């Protein structure tokens, strides 16, 4: 999994969802008056509207990622073997990971508001049902000003400021940030010959400033490549050019089918990529077998409704036959 | 630039066209009776029909890459500082690099036929009575059985069998193949802990078998990454799943705008990606700011015409607004 | 700096001391009745004898590394920006870093004993003198059974089991161990072609299993290279062969003069390398300009003395002129 | 195998000899009137004196490397699968690879003189005996002005100017030089943060400018590391400081025993390292288990003799017991 933020006049938030198999992912808009019931904290009968992509092997919006109508986004990413969820703890806001995106996005308009809410959070090991046990996750949250990372591990709950607006999978975020220090010399420009002033070395290709950038599909390597690609990206400050660049950033760390054999005949691959415009409440996505970008605009729905609005994803290639 | 072949059930051929600017690329179908005139070899008044992307700035089809109606494809890729074109030589077939795609694809139905035609080729330093735009190039050719690489350098003309169906930019192809030896251990599966049997090392991420794969945008790194990605790709044999995988393979080595700063506020980036179905005569492409796949089928045109059939490329983002 | 352990029938402990300036280093044997006075904990009037290399100032043994007569070793290595020393704390054993090697090695015969002593250590920010402020350091300790690492940072005092018997400089030891996970595939044997079963890749050199091993002189890269080299070393279980292999392991991560420019035309380089036999109480060393190994055997001295026994180091190249 | 040149005030030439076993290497001085008999070219009854290390399995001086009394040096390095020796060719100087060092060093005082002699060379496939078939080799030659590389492959005989004064094993020398282009950015100084101006990246270690330098024991990685370590080396002009730096350079690419398992409980490892002073006719060496430098000075022998002067190598550890 890879989640990023990117700004090009509007603030975009989105992710590659990387997994072995596709479980009826759908675009779900949760309107303001869809009541959220929580297992161990108070209910939210009226809250901010949310749009995201959800699993939807249930009626409840089981989001993988989403944004709300105020421009706060949140994404859960795989954190296998590092995630640690806790016993109910008296005096904390005991929230299950499956409730966590609704809990935050329902009531917070900004990352700063989320940080205050996270001060008393305890992420509890309460399954949605015995049918649907918890995934091991960590989270990226982002608004139009900043992003943070939330990690609940055996050591406890940590909330990090994210200076690069990227998250992937394991290990913990402090390690991910640290490892970037090893890549300081990488450049978008022609590297100087520091190797020796006594010999001529030839620039036989463009792009040589990036040599050392890792290209494998592992978590830490994707973190470095996404970060370098994100921070050095350029694009016009127009919607279509901006989201194009965003999906190019996510493409740079997508996982092609066949390359990550997880055993059986199974491969981890990038099932979908999303790009959310935080200002405009638009969720864009592409899927592995549909390269055309599809847009769902939360503001075209009636956000005072009580009922989930669910759209299927376009998963087959939409080709322009030009003749 | 990156060109590849990939077989599912059909045989596909195509490329990333990487450059600093998009300037009037078009899809040009050259019908059978559009006369090809050549400066130093005999004319081809009647020939195989061809479909490709060309530089729209000439009245003649100046192809970057193309396929013919018999399933033979050819692509010219940048080879700056390596390409060497020659004086007219008595007894050779003297063909300019700008004539070379029409020369081959006009009259050859297979790669084996092209090898025979290439036996007395001399690639000559001509554009008639002026000095030289002539781009420094080398070529990938491919049919439904095989691919080869054609390089004219200061050492002479070499035609290589291509065991991996990939080409990029500099250096020479024997070096590109040789360099693959350094990557033999890379795997799609979980790597064994060979480092030491005395310590426990954790598989904290999927994809770790690929560690060592280079992820910078230089020519040799893109050759390695495209090759590893192509050879380990998997897809269903359906047209749509096949071309999807094809464009994924090309995406793995695309150049995102901003990452290769060539000076003057310019960047080398992937202006378009093509995928051609050799069996069906269909040219598919995506452009940097249009993620939707566009298809142009040569067999829908009148191939007995005398005149070029030219389609502009769709270069603005084609979004499916689903609500 | 790099410190290691290595076993080849005897248990060896030692280090490269890497720095831009020598502080007049000597071999110092501290006998059993040289009284150790401590600033904030009880004195050790009678203790285990110790041999090591110390900064040559003739009033207290300021050890860089040392071993005692019971086979326990300890080394201080640079930890700049990471080391944090503390205020005096009531209820702790408040020991200055300059006292720390005498404190441990004076009274502990094993690493397990040192772990018990460290349980209530607080490493306090008390200078030897105003003329010689504390260095930022961390420590490796090793006996004939195991090794540990001791790190006092802004988060607190941590004592790690060291499963590889290696330490270098920054960052913290948990990151150093974790990073080894990225190197699991590295092998001393011929790597298999996992890259693709469809092409032939040639083993054109020996040693190709190690591709990926980093060769720069930075802390993390030396940690990885030293660890791989140490764990995969072989040697006869005879003294001369064993210590030869030891010095080969240290040579693999030594810093050549000219390669680490630290600014004022000063260079960080490996001033000396040591190898101590824990069973025999022998301190062997080589120096940057003296490749011959020199041996100082603590057991040849009178260990009941009151006074430091100091040997100057052999620093000039000792050549065998054979004709 | 690795051979280098290095200049301080004197010009030095030497090599690591890397192989699976040590069997009777000796230092052999060939005096001026030891007759060299050649299989297919004229004899050299009187020639320059030569000192080097040879295989001590024949009466004939089978040199691995050597220098002559005029300051020309030559080394044969393993080139397995690349070396190609030829049939006897009329009108060439047909010289066997076992004769080649004597042939050159016997009659040439400079590299320019060797280039002239090599114009008509044909390296022929004539074994020393059927018991001892030819090794696949290539050669480095060096005088007090320059060095060159000699490679006889299936493509023919090539003589390259060597701008870096380094050679290892496979592949061909043009590739080795080319590959150095990939390392241009490596520096002995602190690298700038070019990765992104928007984030702070910490220089947590010295020596970070070398990151990317390969540290495995394979031929191409050793070439790069040796070249970087040689060109950026510094030392005082004294003989002893000069040869120490030289042996430090060679140490940086030595092969530790255990790390290159070639099967059968055998390892490729650095059996000896040499350093020759070209001006003074002194052959210095160290062996895997003898870290002390040993020196054999050709000018202390009677160079008018007829007979080989042979010194066994010191191969057991020479320790200075200071106590």
Beta-strand runs (E) in chain A:
2-8, 10-19, 26-30, 50-54, 63-68, 73-78, 93-95, 121-123, 137-142, 147-153, 156-161, 166-167, 261-263, 266-267, 269-277, 282-287, 290-297, 309-312, 320-321
What resolution does the deposited structure have, in angstroms? 2.0
Phi, psi of C38 (to 5 degrees): -120, 145
B149, two tokens: 């690489």
- In Å, the largest CA–CA distance within chain A is 74
Helix/strand/coil (H/E/C) assignment for every residue in chain C: CEEEEEEECEEEEEEEEEECCCCCEEEEEECCCCCECCCCCCCECCCCCEEEEEECCCCCCEEEEEEECCCCEEEEEECCCCCCCECCCCCCEEECHHHHHHHHHHHCCCHHHHHHHHCCEEEECCCCECCECCCCEEEEEECCCCEEEEEEECCEEEEEECCCCEECCCCCHHHHHHHHHHHCCCCCCCCCCCCCCCCCCCCCCCCHHHCCCECCCCHHHHHHHHHHHHHCCCCCCCHHHHHHHHHHHHHCCCCCCCCCECCCCCECEEEEEEEEECCCCEEEEEECCEEEEEEEEHHHCCCCCCCCEEEECCCCCCCEECC
The answer to whether C259 and C267 have CB atoms below 8 angstroms apart is yes
Q: How many domains does chain B have?
A: 1
A175, two tokens: 């390690």
Three-state DSSP class for residue B226: helix
CA atoms of D217 and D226, how far apart (whole Å): 11
Q: Which of A1, A108, A275, A276 is catalytic?
A: A1
D43, two tokens: 């004899």
Neighbours of chain C (3+ CB pairs under 8 A): A, B, D
Does A178 reside within a domain? yes
Cβ-defined contact of C207 to D255 (cutoff 8 Å): yes
CA atoms of D117 and D72, how far apart (whole Å): 14
Q: Which residue(s) pair with C307 in the sheet?
A: none
Instruction: Tell me which chain C residues have a C-beta less than 8 angstroms from the C-beta of B209.
Output: 185, 194
Cβ-defined contact of B184 to C204 (cutoff 8 Å): no
Tally C-beta pairs within 8 A across A and B: 250
Nearest chain B residue (CA) to D219? B182
CA atoms of A23 and B75, how far apart (whole Å): 40
Cβ-defined contact of B213 to A212 (cutoff 8 Å): no
Active site residue B260: no
Nearest chain B residue (CA) to C201? B181
User: What is the Rg, in whole angstroms, of the alpha carbon atoms belonging to chain B?
Assistant: 20
Cβ-defined contact of A256 to B249 (cutoff 8 Å): yes
CA atoms of A318 and A322, how far apart (whole Å): 12
Residue tagged 């792009």 (tokens) = A207
Q: DSSP assignment of B6-47, as one string?
A: EESSSEEEEEEEEES----EEEEEE-TTSPBP-SSS--BSS-
Neighbours of chain D (3+ CB pairs under 8 A): A, B, C
Three-state DSSP class for residue A91: coil
Phi, psi of B28 (to 5 degrees): -120, 125
Q: How many CB atoms lie within 10 A of CB D228?
A: 28
Closest C-alpha to B12, from B272, B177, B245: B245
Helix C239-251 and helix C219-231, axial crossing angle in degrees, nearest 10: 150
Phi, psi of D180 (to 5 degrees): -60, -20
Q: How many CB atoms lie within 10 A of CB B199?
A: 14
In this complex, the residue of B164, B203, B208 whose CB is nearest that of residue C199 is B164
Question: Pairing relation of β-strands C269-277 and D2-7?
Answer: unpaired
Instruction: Tell me which chain C residues have a C-beta less than 8 angstroms from the C-beta of B200.
Output: 163
CATH code where residue D157 lies: 3.60.60.10
B192, two tokens: 């064994």
The CA-atom distances, in angstroms, between A144 and each of A8, A67, A320, D256 are 11, 11, 35, 55
Interface of A with D (CB under 8 A): 163-164, 178, 180-189, 191-196, 198-204, 208-209, 211-212, 228, 231-232
Residue tagged 């043994």 (tokens) = C61
Interface of C with A (CB under 8 A): 171, 175, 178, 182, 220
Helix D111-118 and helix D100-107, axial crossing angle in degrees, nearest 10: 130
Question: Residue D57 burial by CB count (10 A; 0-12/13-18/19+): exposed, middle or buried?
Answer: middle
The whole-angstrom distance between residue A61's C-alpha and the CA centroid of its chain comes to 17
CA atoms of C47 and C70, how far apart (whole Å): 11
A158, two tokens: 């940590």
CA pseudo-torsion sign A318, A323, B3, B5: positive
DSSP tag of A246? H
Q: DSSP assignment of A123-140, as one string?
A: EB---SBTTBPPPPEEEE
HSE, side-chain direction, 13 A CA sphere, residue D278? 28
CA atoms of D173 and D148, how far apart (whole Å): 10
- In Å, the largest CA–CA distance within chain C is 74
Cβ-defined contact of C195 to B184 (cutoff 8 Å): yes
Does C322 reside within a domain? no
In sequence order, which residues have a C-beta less than 8 Å from that of residue B74 and are 6 or more positions away?
B63, B65, B66, B67, B100, B101, B104, B105, B139, B140, B141, B142
The CA-atom distances, in angstroms, between A15 and each of A18, A144, A315, B264 are 9, 16, 17, 32
Does D321 reside within a domain? no
| Mutation choice for B interface testing from C196, C210, C233 by most B CBs within 10 A | C196
Nearest chain B residue (CA) to C191? B185
Closest C-alpha to A234, from B205, C186, B267: B267
In sequence order, which residues have a C-beta less than 8 Å from that of residue A89 and are 6 or more positions away?
A122, A124
CA atoms of D122 and D86, how far apart (whole Å): 7
Interface of B with C (CB under 8 A): 163-164, 178, 180-189, 191-196, 198-204, 208-209, 211-212, 228, 231-232
Question: Residue A296 burial by CB count (10 A; 0-12/13-18/19+): exposed, middle or buried?
Answer: buried
C36, two tokens: 């150790």
Give the CA dihedral D63, D68, D69, D72, nearest 10 degrees: -160
CA atoms of B124 and B152, how far apart (whole Å): 10
| Mutation choice for C interface testing from A178, A184, A214 by most C CBs within 10 A | A178
Cβ-defined contact of D185 to A194 (cutoff 8 Å): yes
C-beta contacts of C45-51 below 8 A and 24+ residues apart: C47/C102, C47/C106, C47/C107, C48/C72, C48/C105, C48/C106, C48/C107, C48/C108, C48/C109, C49/C298, C49/C303, C50/C101, C50/C102, C50/C105, C50/C106, C50/C298, C51/C27, C51/C276, C51/C281, C51/C283, C51/C296, C51/C298
In sequence order, which residues have a C-beta less than 8 Å from that of residue A82 and are 6 or more positions away?
A136, A138, A151, A153, A170, A171, A172, B204
Order of strands, edge to edge, in the sheet holding A63-68? A156-161, A147-153, A137-142, A73-78, A63-68, A50-54, A26-30, A309-312
Three-state DSSP class for residue A274: strand
Closest C-alpha to D148, from D137, D135, D164, D127: D164
Cβ-defined contact of C180 to B193 (cutoff 8 Å): no
In this complex, the residue of C221, C240, C296 whose CB is nearest that of residue D323 is C296
User: What is the Rg, in whole angstroms, of the alpha carbon atoms belonging to chain C?
Assistant: 20
CA atoms of D63 and D41, how far apart (whole Å): 19
Helix D239-252 and helix D219-231, axial crossing angle in degrees, nearest 10: 150
Element spanning D230, H or E: helix D219-231
CA atoms of D292 and D284, how far apart (whole Å): 10
- In Å, the largest CA–CA distance within chain B is 74
CA atoms of C248 and C254, how far apart (whole Å): 10
The whole-angstrom distance between residue D230's C-alpha and the CA centroid of its chain comes to 14
Instruction: Tell me which chain B residues have a C-beta less than 8 angstroms from the C-beta of C228.
Output: 195-196
Phi, psi of B242 (to 5 degrees): -70, -50
In sequence order, which residues have a C-beta less than 8 Å from that of residue C45 and are 6 or more positions away?
C33, C35, C36
The answer to whether D146 and D115 have CB atoms below 8 angstroms apart is no
- In Å, the largest CA–CA distance within chain D is 74
In sequence order, which residues have a C-beta less than 8 Å from that of residue A112 and are 6 or more positions away?
A145
Neighbours of chain A (3+ CB pairs under 8 A): B, C, D
Cis amide bond preceding A171, omega within 30: yes
CA angle A167, A169, A171 (to 5 degrees): 100
Give the domain extent around B47.
1-313
The answer to whether C53 and C26 have CB atoms below 8 angstroms apart is yes
Three-state DSSP class for residue B122: strand
CA atoms of B34 and C191, how far apart (whole Å): 54
How many angstroms away from the CA of B228 is the closest CA of chain C? Answer: 7
Closest C-alpha to A222, from A179, A261, A271: A179
The whole-angstrom distance between residue D172's C-alpha and the CA centroid of its chain comes to 16
Does C301 reside within a domain? yes
Interface of B with D (CB under 8 A): 171, 175, 178, 182, 220
Cis amide bond preceding D171, omega within 30: yes
Cis amide bond preceding C51, omega within 30: no
CA atoms of D318 and D274, how far apart (whole Å): 17
Neighbours of chain B (3+ CB pairs under 8 A): A, C, D
Does C320 reside within a domain? no
Cβ-defined contact of A216 to B204 (cutoff 8 Å): no
C210, two tokens: 């190690």
HSE, side-chain direction, 13 A CA sphere, residue A315? 12
CA atoms of C312 and C139, how far apart (whole Å): 25
The answer to whether A75 and A46 have CB atoms below 8 angstroms apart is no
The answer to whether A151 and A138 have CB atoms below 8 angstroms apart is yes
Closest C-alpha to B220, from B250, B258, B279, B175: B175
Nearest chain B residue (CA) to D218? B182
B286, two tokens: 């995506």
The CA-atom distances, in angstroms, between B148 and each of A170, B151, B174 are 42, 10, 12
The whole-angstrom distance between residue C201's C-alpha and the CA centroid of its chain comes to 41
Closest C-alpha to B244, from A312, A318, A273, A1: A318
Nearest chain A residue (CA) to B171? A204
In sequence order, which residues have a C-beta less than 8 Å from that of residue D212 and are 6 or more positions away?
A211, A212, C216, D183, D185, D186
Question: Pairing relation of β-strands D93-95 and D121-123?
Answer: parallel
Nearest chain B residue (CA) to D178? B171
The answer to whether A50 and A278 have CB atoms below 8 angstroms apart is no
The answer to whether C164 and C231 have CB atoms below 8 angstroms apart is yes
How many angstroms away from the CA of A111 is the closest CA of chain C? Answer: 27
Cβ-defined contact of C259 to D288 (cutoff 8 Å): no
Nearest chain B residue (CA) to C228? B195
Q: Which of C1, C108, C275, C276 is catalytic?
A: C1
Cβ-defined contact of A171 to C182 (cutoff 8 Å): no
CA atoms of D2 and D22, how far apart (whole Å): 17
In sequence order, which residues have a C-beta less than 8 Å from that of residue B58 and are 6 or more positions away?
none
Cβ-defined contact of D259 to C229 (cutoff 8 Å): yes
CA atoms of D229 and D222, how far apart (whole Å): 10
Question: Residue B322 burial by CB count (10 A; 0-12/13-18/19+): exposed, middle or buried?
Answer: middle
CA atoms of A143 and A70, how far apart (whole Å): 9
In this complex, the residue of D163, D187, D202 whose CB is nearest that of residue A194 is D187
Question: Residue B108 burial by CB count (10 A; 0-12/13-18/19+): exposed, middle or buried?
Answer: buried
Does B318 reside within a domain? no
CA atoms of C244 and C234, how far apart (whole Å): 11
Instruction: Tell me which chain B residues have a C-beta less than 8 angstroms from the C-beta of D178.
Output: 171, 175
DSSP tag of B155? T
How many angstroms away from the CA of D313 is the closest CA of chain C? Answer: 9
Cβ-defined contact of B323 to A314 (cutoff 8 Å): no
B315, two tokens: 């270069």
Beta-strand runs (E) in D200-313:
261-263, 266-267, 269-277, 282-287, 290-297, 309-312
Nearest chain D residue (CA) to C240? D317
Q: Which residue(s) pair with B55 in the sheet?
A: B25, B62
How many angstroms away from the CA of D175 is the closest CA of chain B? Answer: 7
The answer to whether A267 and B207 have CB atoms below 8 angstroms apart is no
CA atoms of C31 and C199, how far apart (whole Å): 66
Helix/strand/coil (H/E/C) assignment for every residue in A1-14: CEEEEEEECEEEEE
Cβ-defined contact of D295 to C319 (cutoff 8 Å): yes
Phi, psi of C272 (to 5 degrees): -150, 160
CA atoms of A246 and A16, how far apart (whole Å): 11
Interface of C with B (CB under 8 A): 163-164, 178, 180-189, 191-196, 198-204, 208-209, 211-212, 228, 231-232
Closest C-alpha to A250, from A136, A145, A167: A167
Closest C-alpha to B100, from B135, B57, B145, B58: B135
Instruction: Tell me which chain D residues have a C-beta less than 8 angstroms from the C-beta of C191.
Output: none
Question: Residue C307 burial by CB count (10 A; 0-12/13-18/19+): exposed, middle or buried?
Answer: exposed
């Amino acid at each position: 999994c890879t989640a990023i933020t990117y700004v090009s006049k509007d603030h975009y938030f989105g992710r590659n969802f990387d997994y072995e198999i596709s479980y009826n992912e759908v675009v779900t808009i949760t309107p303001r008056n869809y009541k959220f019931s929580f297992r161990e904290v108070g209910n939210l009968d009226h809250h901010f509207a949310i749009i995201g992509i959800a699993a939807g092997i249930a009626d409840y919006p089981l989001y993988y990622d989403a944004i709300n109508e105020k421009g706060l986004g949140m994404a859960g990413l795989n954190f296998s073997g590092y995630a640690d969820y806790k016993k109910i703890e008296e005096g904390k806001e005991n929230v299950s990971p499956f409730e966590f995106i609704p809990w935050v996005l329902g009531q917070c308009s900004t990352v700063d508001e989320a940080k205050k809410l996270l001060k008393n959070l305890n992420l509890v090991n309460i399954n949605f049902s015995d049918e649907l046990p918890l995934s091991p996750l960590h989270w990226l949250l982002a608004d139009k000003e900043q992003s943070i990372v939330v990690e609940s591990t055996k050591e406890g709950l940590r909330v990090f400021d994210n200076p690069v607006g990227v998250l992937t999978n394991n290990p913990t975020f402090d390690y991910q940030l640290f490892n970037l220090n090893n890549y300081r010399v990488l450049s978008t420009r022609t590297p100087k010959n520091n190797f020796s002033d006594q010999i001529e070395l030839d620039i036989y290709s463009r792009g040589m400033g990036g040599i050392g950038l890792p290209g494998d599909l592992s978590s830490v390597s994707r973190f470095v490549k996404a970060t370098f690609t994100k921070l050095n990206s350029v694009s016009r400050s127009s919607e279509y050019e901006s989201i194009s660049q965003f999906f190019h950033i996510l493409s740079s760390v997508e996982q092609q089918k066949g390359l990550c054999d997880v055993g059986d005949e199974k491969y981890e691959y990038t099932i979908y990529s999303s790009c959310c415009n935080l200002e405009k409440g638009i969720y864009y996505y592409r899927t592995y077998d549909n390269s055309q970008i599809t847009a769902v605009d939360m503001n075209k729905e009636n956000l005072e409704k009580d009922s989930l609005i669910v759209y299927p994803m376009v998963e087959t290639q939409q080709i322009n036959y030009a003749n």
